[PDB]
């Protein structure tokens with residue numbers, strides 16, 4: 033069929049398209065020593081009072097990138113139990129909001145075999161929920177990450193192109209040295225389809241892939257002992273102490289910083305940090321140590337990585353790069369002082385009553401797959 037061809041650097045030109053033969057080449061062929069080391073901290077799943085205080089402790093308005101702006105993270109938000117006033121405030125503070133589906137269906141075979149329409153209802157539907165109940169009007173909800181990192185073959189990416197999503201961050205790249213830069217899906221993936229029973233795209237799709245490089249979990253990377261990598265931090269099951277986590281962060285930082293400076297992805301679940309105080313303590317110690325010692329390291333959103341790829345800036349130029357200064361150091365007031373607490377039901381979620389907090393008036397129905405606005409209208 034129309035299998036995407038291997039990367040052709042002649043018809044894949046910035047800013048629409050970026051590829052290299054193995055995914056390790058730096059955009060714009062900048063020297064590695066002049067490339068800012070980007071770090072994309074991300075958090076999956078619901079934003080609510082289970083984790084709102086954790087995010088305040090991390091993103092305290094005192095941790096700043098070398099451009100003077102607050103460090104920024106990306107939230108892949110799933111619908112159930114999410115507080116949309118909190119999503120709105122997180123966005124107001126300059127963090128990126130992306131979608132992680134409505135249902136977070138735990139049947140992994142559903143995702144790997146879902147139709148284009150199924151992917152659309154889950155992901156475009158979740159975008160509708162966020163844009164409405166968090167009142168986000170600037171079309172900045174543009175990223176997708178699938179539950180359980182289940183890639184949806186071509187169907188997922190056909191959906192994302194039809195729905196005008198900017199990027200996916202579901203595809204894992206096996207532990208590699210050097211690690212991989214993001215790539216667009218117009219051309220063949222520069223690495224194997226990785227993971228149990230994974231179905232990866234094969235055709236050309238006008239979608240960016242914020243590829244998830246596995247991290248090296250080896251406690252002593254000096255051997256030649258071989259261990260599978262890990263993409264989600266909490267899937268690195270040998271990390272048991274704060275000291276191990278601290279060394280793990282340094283080792284994988286160095287892997288990126290000392291090679292091709294590919295963006296380093298630190299992909300979290302809030303609960304993993306919250307339930308393990310020594311991990312949170314080690315993480316913050318590490319962040320603060322990296323920020324003080326590096327004038328060339330930026331904690332940025334996923335969209336901000338793509339913006340750099342589209343217009344590569346050296347470390348010196350990065351200080352005044354305007355996309356990285358959007359919502360530089362937001363203070364101000366929340367969109368509403370006391371959000372509505374909506375107790376909602378829906379025949380799509382039979383039995384449950386789910387509280388949804390929003391600055392908007394409560395909808396008549398609990399939003400779900402077949403009614404993402406919660407308006408209860410007939411179709």
Ligand SMILES: *[C@@H]1O[C@H](CO)[C@@H](O[C@@H]2O[C@H](CO)[C@@H](O)[C@H](O)[C@H]2NC(C)=O)[C@H](O)[C@H]1NC(C)=O
Nearest residue numbers: 080081084115117118121366368369370371389
């Ligand atoms: C939902 O999230 C919002 C936003 O963080 C929380 O809103 C706070 O609500 C209290 C009410 O006691 C107000 O005093 C604050 O001004 C609000 N904060 C902001 C930043 O607007 C709300 O408490 C959350 N509710 C639940 C149930 O999770």
Ligand SMILES: *[C@@H]1O[C@H](CO)[C@@H](O)[C@H](O)[C@H]1NC(C)=O
Nearest residue numbers: 166167168169367391392393
């Ligand atoms: C969304 O935010 C704008 C900007 O503050 C505000 O004027 C508008 O009323 C909000 N929309 C809704 C439906 O609350």
Ligand SMILES: [Zn+2]
Nearest residue numbers: 076077179180
């Ligand atoms: Zn999830």
